[PDB]
Design a protein around this ligand. Structure first.
Ligand code: MET
Length: 519
């Protein structure tokens, strides 16, 4: 089905200021978004803020400000952070938005009409910080900020409290068999694979019904009212998860403001998400509750949920981007960690990767193929006959787009970067063997062949890196003199798409692409 590629970040709680966790989650969302745009697809990338609930209201009360003022302020800090980080997200949703609330009520009403919401009790543990219901097996003894002996979440270590409320209850237990069918029928729907296995084990163990409302006093009245029962408010997670549906139904203008909410999601061709990006801490909500809601409502299910190794919720990313470069930082975060949390975030290692990979591997190579010394005519030369060594490198360059594409689609952005850099290392090796600096005098016919391959290797690697390094890719292409039309589209993944005779861009006397730093 030709649709709009719909990729989401989670919507972030506004109890605290934006931080690296949020920036990472939204970076992954953004990169996926960018890759599909580079592929020539229609894209709708979504991010935003999760503004209702007990936690946000209590954080606003601690600041001695009204929940409305506080959410608006913090949402502003989030918006500004994401502008600073130079993302290309299509819309920023807020759960306080009136159109969002409409969609929630509409969804609630469907679930109710379907017979899947009933009036019952929740008597059990709850983590206000996680906004999560927990069984007694998921808690242990612990300490709080008054040093007192309390109970805490095994998940997150935050304080838990016993709740005993009459609550609207969603019949999650009825969806165990259908969820298991879904997981088994769609074995790539949860990535990475060990998290897919974790979800399945949990659903196999059995599912309780889920409390989807709370008494309004418990939430300090800071929530969406239940349709036809103002004594109750809608659970912040049903509220929150529904942002993805709301987002898929908003017409947005050129400045990024929502102008209209369509009735039927099919009108905008976004729903359901192709990729939900989340942290590992909210997997249950996205892989169990969310599909169960959609199943109840007869709505289509997402294609993939990708759960990274970090938590959704010092090291300030805007500070480090100003210190080391924006694209460089993004590169580092995406390169340094896969789905394991174990990975070394340190000035030592940021500099190791900056110098080793960005400067010495990529940057070095860009300068070699464009310098006046080696590229004497300042153009893409026409190649002479290819040796078997030439062919071996060409093969790597030809194969790379297909390999990188599979990685980007999993999605595993670390592996995609690695694949591209393997080819970059190969090109450096090739350039070392051929010694094109010697060939300017010794054999100019041979240099044409060597230079051309080098240029084309640089173009193709750069094109596949352009979702990771959106600014630097533009600079590289300007130096190489790659016309705008050749900077995107699957057609331009092909070897040879830029014809010989293309002139390089002008240089400037101070130009480095990535400046190395002191160790
Ligand atoms: C529907 S995604 C909700 C994410 C949640 N607000 C968090 O900050 O973890």
């Amino acid at each position: 089905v030709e649709k709009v590629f719909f990729v989401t970040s989670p919507i972030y709680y506004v109890n605290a200021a934006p931080h690296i966790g949020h920036v990472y989650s939204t970076l992954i969302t953004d990169v996926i978004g960018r890759y599909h745009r580079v592929k020539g697809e229609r894209v709708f990338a979504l991010t935003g803020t999760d503004e209702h609930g007990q936690k946000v209201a209590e954080a606003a009360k601690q600041k001695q400000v009204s929940p409305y003022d506080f959410t608006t302020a913090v949402a502003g800090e989030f918006k500004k952070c994401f502008e600073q980080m130079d993302y290309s997200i299509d819309y920023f949703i807020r759960t306080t938005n009136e159109q969002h609330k409409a969609v929630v009520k509409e969804l609630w009403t469907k679930l109710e009409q379907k017979g899947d919401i009933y009036l019952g009790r929740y008597e059990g543990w709850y983590s206000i910080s996680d906004e999560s219901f927990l069984t007694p097996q998921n808690i242990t003894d612990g300490v709080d900020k008054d040093g007192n002996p309390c109970k805490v979440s095994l998940e997150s270590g935050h304080v838990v409290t016993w709740v005993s409320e009459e609550n609207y209850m969603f019949r999650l237990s009825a969806f165990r068999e259908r969820l298991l069918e879904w997981y088994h029928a769609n074995p790539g729907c949860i990535v990475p694979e060990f998290r897919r296995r974790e979800v399945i084990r949990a659903v196999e163990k059995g599912l309780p019904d889920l409390s989807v409302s709370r008494a309004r006093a418990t939430l300090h009245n800071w929530a969406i009212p239940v349709p036809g029962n103002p004594d109750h408010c809608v659970y912040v997670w049903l509220d929150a998860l529904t942002n993805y549906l709301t987002g898929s139904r908003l017409r947005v203008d050129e400045s990024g403001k929502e102008v209209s909410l369509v009735d039927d999601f099919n009108e905008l061709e976004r729903f359901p998400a192709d990729v939900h990006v989340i942290g590992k801490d909210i997997l249950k909500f996205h892989a169990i509750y969310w599909p169960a809601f959609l199943l109840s409502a007869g709505l289509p299910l997402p294609k993939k949920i990708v759960a990274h190794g970090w938590w959704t919720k010092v090291f300030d990313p805007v500070e480090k981007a100003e210190e080391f470069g924006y694209d460089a930082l993004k590169y580092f975060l995406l390169r340094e960690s896969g789905f394991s949390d174990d990975g070394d975030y340190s000035d030592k290692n940021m500099i190791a990767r900056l110098n080793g990979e960005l400067a010495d591997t990529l940057g070095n190579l860009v300068m070699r193929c464009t310098s006046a010394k080696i590229n004497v005519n300042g153009e893409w030369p026409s190649p002479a006959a290819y040796t078997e060594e030439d062919e071996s490198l060409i093969q790597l360059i030809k194969d790379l787009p297909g390999t990188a594409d599979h990685y980007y689609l999993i999605p595993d952005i670390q592996k995609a970067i690695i694949a591209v850099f393997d080819v970059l290392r190969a090109i450096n090796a090739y350039v070392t063997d051929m010694a094109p600096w010697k060939l300017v005098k010794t054999d100019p016919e041979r240099l044409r062949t060597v230079l051309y391959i080098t240029l084309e290797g640089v173009r193709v690697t750069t094109l596949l890196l352009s979702p990771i390094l959106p600014r630097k890719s533009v600079v590289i292409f300007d130096m190489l003199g790659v016309p705008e039309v050749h900077r995107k589209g699957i057609e331009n993944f092909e070897f040879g798409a830029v014809p010989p005779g293309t002139r390089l861009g002008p240089a400037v006397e101070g130009e480095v692409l990535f400046s190395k730093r002191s160790t």
